[PDB]
Nucleic acid binder design. Structure first.
Lengths: 642, 642
DNA sequence: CGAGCACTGCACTCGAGTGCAGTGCTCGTTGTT
DNA sequence: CGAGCACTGCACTCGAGTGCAGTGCTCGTTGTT
């Protein structure tokens, strides 16, 4: 064969793309265009080493990356590649679970418990027993459990005691799996575990897929957890081969449970395995690439890597030291406002912080100078309340056991159903181990409820069965517009605040637009499909009419980005490195890897700043410059006695 | 010794007064002077036979009688006569019970239960099980109960089961007894029975009394029931010499338990007991006595007698056959209208009827002619609702277990202790066998009652306890004045219609005066005393300004009276004899006796009338003259063709 | 400091209880303590 | 004829349950699916 595939790469990359079929690692750099090498490795497995698209399987963490993945593959391999699996660990585990739902013990219409829902269903359960009041907040409960699923530990697994400190939780977890089951719901963290668990109870399947997907890819491997690794390991027992990109230096998701180890753990658990070091940056200047290396070398146990450019060396890394953040910002604004004055495109920037709280003062400085911008704060469409109300009824329709959907929209729009009443259904639901709708069917037959109550409560349940019916044989975007009206939510929202509700309604109708444009082989009804598309990805926040404007965001939400001009605010001991990390955890190296990520972000200039004084909520305060600025080859940096 | 206890008597009376201490029967026949005989005999018993006022016991039936009896004895015995027990059965009975409450198995503060009280208490019972629904009518239950005690039976006596009919009642009677026993309530029948039983049970007391009361005297003996007869026999073992007085031909209270036979029963149970007949009548003309003797001879089984006189024959008994009762009345009025014109007094004329329904037509007729009149029926003071009411709070203060007092004032004035709430308290009492106040302490304690219910119920209770408290040191009348005020009773009646409302507060005021003049003699606490004298004698109607008026009453309540002029009305077969007395049980002879009682009430002229047609509730009916008219010797009756 | 959420007054809803008029259907007597 | 009497049929009281807007008082990483 000929190669129009490689001619666009450089030996290193080229070496990886053309690599023999077998296990390996592709220690990506940071301007090494790792997506590219991946886009081509598949172009190769199908072209050169001639493998069927039905054996290839890419896997990403974000839907966005794994989607832009599917794109380029299609722009290279001119067409569509059926049989292939390019998704997230989650969406892919889902894919399996929906298919072999039976095997894994899951109703074909199970529902994905998102963050908020899971937390609530927890706050609710904690109460049906002990007393949360700081003693057992819901969050730590959420944490403890995910932490467990991140480790593939079901209730009856982690034995202990002598310390009820743990046992207590151990019990709550028990309930959670119980409650979530009866309801027929599963959490993000569940998909993975439930899936992997299938390959340990349904071997003949485990075979089937190895027996198929003999080629596997896994982007950003430094961010996997112990149950993800353990899942993949099995897909490629021996028969299957597997490439894995990654980079231990950019594993700032250790708290989310990302075993920065695993990268190495791979080389070992997999005897035969090579290694490639794409170390050529095409994103930033040499002056910058340097600062990175020294700085990033202050860690240890690394695999080490020298980041080299082939372009210029560019301007130094100016350093400011304002009296207070009021200045620190005002400085940056002027430093950016000048960039603009000089045909500078305000989108080619990015104030980066260690804590979202740091952004407020940045905005006032900005707005105090006719300069648009836009934070990347969460709150994606499908997370907004008005929408989860809407989708909650829909869930009740696809299933009357969505304990989460129920306890949410049961008395919303307020339909005269108070807690005194609900607390009964709970204590019922709880003591008789039932879903809520189940306790209702009972508490009504048993006629053990107030006249007022039962009559209202019941008025509710009928409203649902009513909607399930009245809309059944309907097309999504119509069934939706109905439920929105017929549940009185629209009504509930046309009567809401000033600036507030005005959007609520709009978001609702967009929910319809959206629904009228949702697309998807048949293996689930157009709703259950949607309700899943809703849980597994939200995204949206009002893509500000491009009218050129700044880019504010924490560092964690900046990985994968690059901007001509870039800044890092709050460069001082306290925030960076963090307080709750300079002491709270000894996870000090992470904070470094981050700064490393933050720098591998600049393209031309790069500015680091910090103030002597700043009010960390409430009282006044003074820190000392970040230990990070010092570990920088001093010839790169440049003070600014402004 | 000299005699002036005799010179005023007639040969026959003397024969009785001076008779020797032994058992005799003075068969007095109306106009006989039986009261005089009883009085002189007693004076004789002390004066001539030298018995002590402590060995003599005169038993009458009405308080009225006893009173008169007493007055006269002291007029002949120009003094006091302490020690003498002169009273009505019930009265005496009760005296004993209070004195020997202990051995009688009764609280020293037992409360007499009057008719309303009794009847209502049953209504609750029957209802607290059975269905009054004409199948087990309270009246019928009551009737059975007293018919039982007149006979001195008891629940655990007349055993049965061969018909639930007598068995249900049997049960009802059972419930009733425990209820009364638990409440410290004794009914009129109980008074007598108990008293008898006490003598059967504690022979050492009977003895005391036999030893003391060696001289019995019983008035109106043909009206005695069995229990009374029995009671008389014991106190008259073999040592007691008893004189009875009465007339078997004037026995008109059979339906109310009287046993006319007891007159002959006295002659058998005590042989050698001779008989003296008082036959010289001093009230009516020879012509009237004449018809009398004939009318009555139609009954058989009598001891017979001949009412004679040493006076004029007088005008004959006249008859008027009115077209209808509207005319009959008119007629009577006219006849009376003459008598008066001729200087006669209206008060010396009496219209007599079999039924009370018969007075309206007459009152009207009397009205129509500006003829003043007074009707001898009457609501009695201590029966008036506003008086039992008032007395019920006082009762609750003496004892919280007066289930009757309770059930009465509990929610009147209305206090919110609504009905539904009581059915609970009622039942709770049934199932657990407790007083209504008892069953409350519990329902309130066990917190088994609703908020409202419990709260009101409580309010009432504390009030009673409050009045009890604030009143313990107050002289009866003050206490009564406060309970009437503070129980909210006054305000209630101060705001009642206008007709009733006005009289009512006034009666309530009379009550305070009453309790103020009340006089009793260390034996019982004032309040307990009064409450007793309030149940044993209710007297009073409206002591009408002695404005000359025509006398209206029934033959029954006419007995013992006398008038120059009398008019018996509606001598129509069906009316009199009453229809009830033609089928109901061969109680014909009694109806004749009734007639006999009527004729003998006239002094000068007796007039008998009867309509051909009359309206009898709704319809017009047509009766035939009473057979009684016939039975009158022709020589004494003169038609009256107007 | 602003963010969030028990956490608490306070107006309301609502229906079981109250309290009392309405309606339809008997079937009738005498009355002290 | 109507008194007595279950019942049914309001209108009303009243307190348990809602329905929300308003004061505070704790506690502060990072964020995909």
């Amino acid at each position: 064969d000929v190669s129009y595939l490689l001619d666009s790469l450089n030996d290193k990359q080229r070496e990886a793309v053309a690599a023999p079929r077998s296990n390996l690692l592709v220690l990506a750099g940071a301007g090494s265009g790792k997506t590219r090498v991946l886009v081509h490795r598949i172009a190769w497995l199908m072209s050169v080493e001639n493998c069927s698209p039905y054996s290839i399987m890419a896997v990403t963490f974000t839907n966005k990356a794994a989607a832009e993945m599917r794109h380029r593959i299609g722009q290279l391999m001119g067409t569509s590649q059926g049989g292939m699996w390019v998704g997230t660990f989650h969406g892919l585990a889902h894919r399996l679970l929906r298919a072999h739902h039976m095997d894994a013990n899951l109703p074909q219409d199970f529902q994905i418990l998102d963050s908020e829902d899971q937390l609530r269903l927890l706050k609710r359960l904690i109460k049906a027993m002990n007393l949360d009041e700081k003693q057992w907040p819901p969050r730590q409960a959420m944490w403890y459990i995910n932490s467990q699923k991140d480790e593939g530990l079901r209730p009856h697994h982690i034995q202990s005691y002598g310390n009820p400190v743990e046992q207590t939780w151990q019990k709550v977890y028990q309930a959670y799996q119980e409650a979530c089951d009866r309801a027929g719901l599963v959490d993000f963290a569940e998909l993975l575990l439930r899936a992997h668990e299938l390959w340990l109870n349904k071997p003949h399947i485990l075979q089937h897929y190895r027996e198929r997907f003999t080629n596997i890819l896994v982007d950003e491997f430094q961010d996997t957890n112990n149950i993800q690794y353990a899942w993949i390991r099995l897909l490629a027992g021996d028969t299957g081969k597997v490439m894995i990109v990654g980079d231990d230096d950019q594993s700032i998701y250790g708290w989310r449970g990302a075993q920065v180890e695993n990268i190495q753990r791979f080389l070992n658990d997999f005897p035969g395995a090579e290694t490639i070091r794409l170390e050529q940056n095409y994103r930033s200047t040499s002056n910058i690439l340097s600062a990175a290396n020294a700085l990033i070398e202050n860690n240890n146990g690394r695999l080490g890597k020298k980041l080299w450019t082939d372009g210029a060396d560019g301007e130094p890394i100016s350093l400011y030291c304002a009296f207070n953040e009021l200045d620190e910002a005002r400085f940056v604004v002027n430093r950016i406002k000048t960039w603009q004055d000089n045909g500078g495109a305000l989108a080619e920037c990015a104030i980066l912080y260690r804590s979202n709280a740091q952004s407020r003062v940045l905005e006032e400085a900005l707005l105090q100078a006719s300069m648009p911008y836009r934070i990347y704060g969460g709150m994606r469409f499908f997370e907004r309340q008005e929408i989860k109300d809407a989708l909650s009824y829909l869930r009740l329709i696809v299933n009357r056991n969505d304990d989460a959907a129920f306890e949410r929209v049961v008395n919303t729009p307020t339909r005269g159903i108070g807690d005194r009443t609900l607390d009964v259904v709970r204590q019922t639901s709880r003591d008789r181990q039932l879903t809520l709708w189940q306790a209702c069917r009972e508490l009504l037959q048993e006629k053990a409820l107030a006249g007022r109550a039962a009559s209202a409560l019941q008025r509710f349940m009928e409203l649902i069965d009513a909607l399930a019916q009245e809309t059944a044989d309907m097309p999504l975007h119509v069934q939706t517009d109905r439920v929105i009206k017929d549940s009185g939510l629209r009504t509930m929202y046309e009567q809401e605040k000033g600036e507030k509700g005005q959007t609520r309604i709009e978001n609702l109708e967009e929910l319809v637009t959206a629904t009228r444009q949702f697309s998807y082989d048949e293996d689930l009804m157009p709703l259950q499909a949607f309700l899943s598309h809703a849980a597994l990805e939200a995204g949206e926040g009002q893509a500000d009419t491009w009218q050129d404007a700044v880019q504010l965001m924490t560092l964690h939400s900046a990985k994968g980005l690059e901007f001509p001009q870039v800044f890092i605010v709050g460069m001082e001991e306290g925030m960076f490195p963090s307080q709750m990390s300079l002491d709270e955890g000894g996870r000090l190296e992470e904070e470094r890897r981050l700064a490393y990520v933050g720098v591998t972000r600049a393209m031309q200039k790069l500015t680091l700043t910090y103030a002597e004084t700043r009010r960390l909520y409430g009282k006044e305060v003074y820190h000392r410059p970040s230990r990070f600025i010092g570990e920088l080859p001093e010839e790169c940096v440049e003070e600014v006695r402004l």
